[PDB]
Design an enzyme around this catalytic site. Sequence first.
Site, PDB file in Angstrom:
ATOM      1  N   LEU A  71       0.803  -1.202   0.000  1.00 33.48           N
ATOM      2  CA  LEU A  71       0.000   0.000   0.000  1.00 33.48           C
ATOM      3  C   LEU A  71       0.850   1.271   0.000  1.00 33.48           C
ATOM      4  O   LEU A  71       0.460   2.265  -0.551  1.00 33.48           O
ATOM      5  CB  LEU A  71      -0.858   0.036   1.234  1.00 33.48           C
ATOM      6  CG  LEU A  71      -2.331  -0.169   1.183  1.00 33.48           C
ATOM      7  CD1 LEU A  71      -2.913  -0.160   2.584  1.00 33.48           C
ATOM      8  CD2 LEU A  71      -2.938   0.959   0.382  1.00 33.48           C
ATOM      9  N   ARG A  89       5.275   2.851   1.091  1.00 28.54           N
ATOM     10  CA  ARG A  89       6.598   2.727   1.701  1.00 28.54           C
ATOM     11  C   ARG A  89       7.099   4.113   2.076  1.00 28.54           C
ATOM     12  O   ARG A  89       7.110   5.012   1.247  1.00 28.54           O
ATOM     13  CB  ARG A  89       7.622   2.025   0.792  1.00 28.54           C
ATOM     14  CG  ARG A  89       9.032   2.026   1.415  1.00 28.54           C
ATOM     15  CD  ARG A  89      10.139   1.852   0.411  1.00 28.54           C
ATOM     16  NE  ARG A  89      10.372   0.438   0.143  1.00 28.54           N
ATOM     17  CZ  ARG A  89      11.303  -0.033  -0.681  1.00 28.54           C
ATOM     18  NH1 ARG A  89      12.125   0.799  -1.312  1.00 28.54           N
ATOM     19  NH2 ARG A  89      11.424  -1.342  -0.873  1.00 28.54           N
ATOM     20  N   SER A 126       8.840   2.461   7.435  1.00 25.21           N
ATOM     21  CA  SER A 126       8.031   1.254   7.334  1.00 25.21           C
ATOM     22  C   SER A 126       7.501   1.066   5.953  1.00 25.21           C
ATOM     23  O   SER A 126       7.555   1.982   5.137  1.00 25.21           O
ATOM     24  CB  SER A 126       6.840   1.328   8.301  1.00 25.21           C
ATOM     25  OG  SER A 126       5.919   2.349   7.933  1.00 25.21           O
ATOM     26  N   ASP A 137       3.386  14.621  13.941  1.00 29.26           N
ATOM     27  CA  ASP A 137       3.468  14.457  12.490  1.00 29.26           C
ATOM     28  C   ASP A 137       2.068  14.597  11.854  1.00 29.26           C
ATOM     29  O   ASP A 137       1.683  13.827  10.963  1.00 29.26           O
ATOM     30  CB  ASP A 137       4.165  13.115  12.158  1.00 29.26           C
ATOM     31  CG  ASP A 137       4.785  13.029  10.763  1.00 29.26           C
ATOM     32  OD1 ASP A 137       5.066  14.086  10.176  1.00 29.26           O
ATOM     33  OD2 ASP A 137       5.032  11.892  10.289  1.00 29.26           O
TER      34      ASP A 137
HETATM   35  O1  LIG Z   1      -1.585   8.250   2.727  1.00 26.82           O
HETATM   36  C1  LIG Z   1      -2.646   7.977   3.274  1.00 26.82           C
HETATM   37  C2  LIG Z   1      -3.527   9.056   3.855  1.00 26.82           C
HETATM   38  C3  LIG Z   1      -3.918  10.092   2.824  1.00 26.82           C
HETATM   39  N1  LIG Z   1      -4.721  11.172   3.402  1.00 26.82           N
HETATM   40  C4  LIG Z   1      -5.309  12.038   2.380  1.00 26.82           C
HETATM   41  C5  LIG Z   1      -5.968  13.270   2.951  1.00 26.82           C
HETATM   42  C6  LIG Z   1      -6.183  13.404   4.312  1.00 26.82           C
HETATM   43  C7  LIG Z   1      -6.792  14.530   4.833  1.00 26.82           C
HETATM   44  C8  LIG Z   1      -7.205  15.568   3.997  1.00 26.82           C
HETATM   45  C9  LIG Z   1      -7.827  16.779   4.602  1.00 26.82           C
HETATM   46  C10 LIG Z   1      -7.165  18.007   4.589  1.00 26.82           C
HETATM   47  C11 LIG Z   1      -7.739  19.125   5.167  1.00 26.82           C
HETATM   48  C12 LIG Z   1      -8.976  19.042   5.768  1.00 26.82           C
HETATM   49  C13 LIG Z   1      -9.644  17.840   5.784  1.00 26.82           C
HETATM   50  C14 LIG Z   1      -9.080  16.716   5.208  1.00 26.82           C
HETATM   51  C15 LIG Z   1      -6.989  15.419   2.633  1.00 26.82           C
HETATM   52 CL1  LIG Z   1      -7.493  16.657   1.523  1.00 26.82          CL
HETATM   53  C16 LIG Z   1      -6.377  14.297   2.112  1.00 26.82           C
HETATM   54  N2  LIG Z   1      -3.089   6.732   3.406  1.00 26.82           N
HETATM   55  C17 LIG Z   1      -2.477   5.595   2.732  1.00 26.82           C
HETATM   56  C18 LIG Z   1      -1.479   4.877   3.618  1.00 26.82           C
HETATM   57  C19 LIG Z   1      -2.129   4.228   4.818  1.00 26.82           C
HETATM   58  O2  LIG Z   1      -3.320   3.952   4.837  1.00 26.82           O
HETATM   59  N3  LIG Z   1      -1.289   4.027   5.858  1.00 26.82           N
HETATM   60  C20 LIG Z   1      -1.557   3.411   7.106  1.00 26.82           C
HETATM   61  C21 LIG Z   1      -2.760   2.793   7.417  1.00 26.82           C
HETATM   62  C22 LIG Z   1      -3.009   2.386   8.715  1.00 26.82           C
HETATM   63  C23 LIG Z   1      -2.068   2.594   9.706  1.00 26.82           C
HETATM   64  C24 LIG Z   1      -0.854   3.197   9.405  1.00 26.82           C
HETATM   65  C25 LIG Z   1       0.100   3.575  10.479  1.00 26.82           C
HETATM   66  O3  LIG Z   1       1.230   3.948  10.217  1.00 26.82           O
HETATM   67  O4  LIG Z   1      -0.338   3.418  11.691  1.00 26.82           O
HETATM   68  C26 LIG Z   1      -0.598   3.583   8.095  1.00 26.82           C
END
Ligand SMILES: O=C(CCNCc1ccc(-c2ccccc2)c(Cl)c1)NCCC(=O)Nc1cccc(C(=O)O)c1
EC number: 2.7.11.1
Length: 327
Positions: free
Chosen positions: A43, A45, A49, A154
């Site tokens: 998903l 990198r 991690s 962060d």
């Molecule tokens: O990259 C992402 C998140 C991507 N966010 C996209 C995003 C988030 C917030 C807003 C926002 C901004 C301003 C106001 C309101 C909203 C916007 Cl426009 C976009 N996800 C993919 C990776 C992922 O799911 N990682 C993951 C999942 C679960 C646990 C962990 C962890 O490290 O614990 C990591």
Amino acid sequence: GPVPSRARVYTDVNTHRPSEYWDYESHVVEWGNQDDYQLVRKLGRGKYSEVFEAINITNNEKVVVKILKPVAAAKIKREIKILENLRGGPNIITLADIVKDPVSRTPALVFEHVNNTDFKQLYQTLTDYDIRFYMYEILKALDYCHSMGIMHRDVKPHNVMIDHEHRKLRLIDWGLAEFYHPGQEYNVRVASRYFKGPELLVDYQMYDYSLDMWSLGCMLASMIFRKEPFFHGHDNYDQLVRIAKVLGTEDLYDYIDKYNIELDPRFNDILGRHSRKRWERFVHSENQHLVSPEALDFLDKLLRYDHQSRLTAREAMEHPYFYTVVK
Ligand SMILES: O=C(CCNCc1ccc(-c2ccccc2)c(Cl)c1)NCCC(=O)Nc1cccc(C(=O)O)c1
């Protein structure tokens, strides 16, 4: 030297709670079964991690597996303890299991499944109402972790998971999070460049939960003004100059003088003299639909140099910007 600082809220949390709560180094991990999980696809990198779509074959449920890259053992135990402490809290990612990855020989954290709405779709199509709704959801997560004596350190869109189809939000990646202990000097090399608080940029180590409120402000400014990032620094030094071109240099000097902070002499040539700008100057026909007097007033109360003067997460939830949000 510098004048000490302490948070104006939740100073006592880690004193009131027992040592096992914050003494992450003493925590004993009860390892789960790595054979219970089957990796489906990568998903993402990052520097610390790799994250994968997975299936828990014992209950046929989708999960997310975060395999940690080899790093100091202290960083790993800290994230585990923080996740276990915050588990069940509003909009906090749920840690379901901890296993030893057989290949990397490092811990692999298993989380509840998340389904990220395309990032470009969120940035480009969330409405004024949706922005307020999701900002309120982030504030619930931040007041919870702050009230539990933890700062995230962060806060940025990459660390916010939005499943728009389900109006579901989770604050993720607690790998840089820390326990707040009054008088503790922390590492200033935290947060992504564009989200760094002035305290980090001037090397002021005795910071607190309020660092997250500055980062939240940067994320909001960028969203409502359609300017990504809002403070676009070339490096850590120019990052402070970009902030000073909006907040002004007079309040920056008042800030460093209050804490007896001396700027790096590198700033003598590049900082200049800048007036504080009114937030209405960033409004234009392509972002007017996301801006309101309430949005500007909210932003004005987050983006303050003085970390002790920013709205706290709980005060932020009371702001008129959220009156329209269905509660
Ligand atoms: O990259 C992402 C998140 C991507 N966010 C996209 C995003 C988030 C917030 C807003 C926002 C901004 C301003 C106001 C309101 C909203 C916007 Cl426009 C976009 N996800 C993919 C990776 C992922 O799911 N990682 C993951 C999942 C679960 C646990 C962990 C962890 O490290 O614990 C990591």
